[PDB]
Design an enzyme around this catalytic site. Structure first.
Site, PDB file in Angstrom:
ATOM      1  CE1 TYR A  60      49.082 -14.397  35.609  1.00 28.10           C
ATOM      2  CE2 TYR A  60      51.197 -13.308  35.981  1.00 28.10           C
ATOM      3  CZ  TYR A  60      49.829 -13.408  36.203  1.00 28.10           C
ATOM      4  OH  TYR A  60      49.187 -12.499  37.028  1.00 28.10           O
ATOM      5  CB  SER A 130      55.213 -21.361  32.263  1.00 26.90           C
ATOM      6  OG  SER A 130      55.322 -20.829  33.585  1.00 26.90           O
ATOM      7  CD1 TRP A 155      54.570 -22.001  38.757  1.00 28.59           C
ATOM      8  CD2 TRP A 155      52.343 -22.034  38.534  1.00 28.59           C
ATOM      9  NE1 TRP A 155      54.025 -21.387  39.869  1.00 28.59           N
ATOM     10  CE2 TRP A 155      52.662 -21.384  39.735  1.00 28.59           C
ATOM     11  CE3 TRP A 155      50.997 -22.162  38.161  1.00 28.59           C
ATOM     12  CZ2 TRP A 155      51.676 -20.883  40.607  1.00 28.59           C
ATOM     13  CZ3 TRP A 155      50.020 -21.651  39.015  1.00 28.59           C
ATOM     14  CH2 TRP A 155      50.370 -21.017  40.219  1.00 28.59           C
ATOM     15  CG  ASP A 176      61.875 -22.913  36.176  1.00 29.79           C
ATOM     16  OD1 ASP A 176      61.514 -21.877  36.776  1.00 29.79           O
ATOM     17  OD2 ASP A 176      61.160 -23.473  35.302  1.00 29.79           O
ATOM     18  CG  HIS A 208      60.102 -20.389  33.952  1.00 26.08           C
ATOM     19  ND1 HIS A 208      59.545 -21.587  34.348  1.00 26.08           N
ATOM     20  CD2 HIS A 208      59.079 -19.608  33.531  1.00 26.08           C
ATOM     21  CE1 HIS A 208      58.231 -21.525  34.193  1.00 26.08           C
ATOM     22  NE2 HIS A 208      57.922 -20.334  33.707  1.00 26.08           N
TER      23      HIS A 208
END
Ligand SMILES: [Cl-]
Ligand SMILES: [Cl-]
Length: 261
Positions: A60, A130, A155, A176, A208
């Site tokens: 993102y 991610s 994620w 993270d 992260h």
């Protein structure tokens, strides 16, 4: 003997280096000509042969610049690699899954003959950072024909990946705070079937954003995983089993796997 073996017999130092043994060239993919994703860069080995192909997604707000180093490094070990931009930088994991699939199809069907002639289209893998790592898990669940999947600090709101049959290496980061390993990477690894080839590698002293900076351990174990499973290259089992040191004073925070595979 294994027809897919490429490159010299591996060593730790060869996998930790900034560049592998193949020279690499690049092909640009324009945003508009990229059907179903936002364009990107294809890295490929100059030596004429056929290689497995890998598509890598950013996360993102990320662009292909955040993953370029890893695409180029992996290609230098004998892979055709596309680092993509997404349709928008705010796309969610399950959208990124569709875009990774579109990028694989692009490399096989719509890239130049220079790229396509170097791809064994039956040996494909996906990776992502991610939300791109969440997209990697989703595509792996949807496409059992993939040969490997590597979610990097992934994620995803879905924690149940029991449908995945693809050899999967999850890389987490111990510090993270964006996709904490306790609520993302570790639950994902735990839900993967015990009967598949899988591993969990938690980086020590890493945030992260560790995948966005050249990283010796990410590069080493990404290449070893892709070699072992995209190329069936058992010369690389030695790096995965028993795997990196994770004790006190170790190379990583934690390593788990289903070795011997
Ligand atoms: Cl590290
Ligand atoms: Cl490093």
């Amino acid at each position: 003997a294994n027809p897919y073996e490429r490159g010299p017999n591996p060593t730790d130092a060869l996998l930790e280096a900034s560049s592998g043994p193949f020279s690499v060239s690049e092909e640009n993919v324009s945003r508009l000509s990229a059907s179903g994703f936002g364009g990107g860069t294809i890295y490929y080995p100059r030596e004429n042969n056929t290689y497995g192909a890998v598509a890598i997604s950013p996360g993102y707000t990320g662009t292909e610049a955040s993953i370029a180093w890893l695409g180029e490094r992996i290609a230098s070990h004998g892979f055709v690699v596309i680092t993509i931009d997404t349709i928008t930088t705010l796309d969610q994991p399950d959208s990124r899954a569709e875009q990774l699939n579109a990028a694989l199809n692009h490399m096989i069907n719509r890239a130049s003959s220079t790229v396509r002639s170097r791809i064994d289209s039956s040996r494909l893998a996906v990776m992502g950072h991610s939300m791109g790592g969440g997209g990697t898990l989703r595509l792996a669940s949807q496409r059992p024909d993939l040969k490997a999947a590597i979610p990097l600090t992934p994620w995803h709101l879905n924690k149940n990946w029991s449908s995945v049959t693809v050899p999967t290496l999850i890389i987490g980061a111990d510090l993270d705070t964006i996709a904490p390993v306790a609520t993302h990477a570790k639950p994902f690894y735990n839900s993967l079937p015990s009967s598949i080839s899988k591993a969990y590698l938690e980086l020590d002293g890493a945030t992260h954003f560790a995948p966005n900076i050249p990283n010796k351990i990410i590069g080493k174990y990404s290449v070893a995983w892709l070699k072992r499973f995209v190329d069936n290259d058992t010369r690389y089992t030695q790096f995965l089993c028993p795997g990196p040191r994770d004790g006190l004073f170790g190379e990583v925070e934690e390593y788990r796997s289903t070795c011997p595979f």
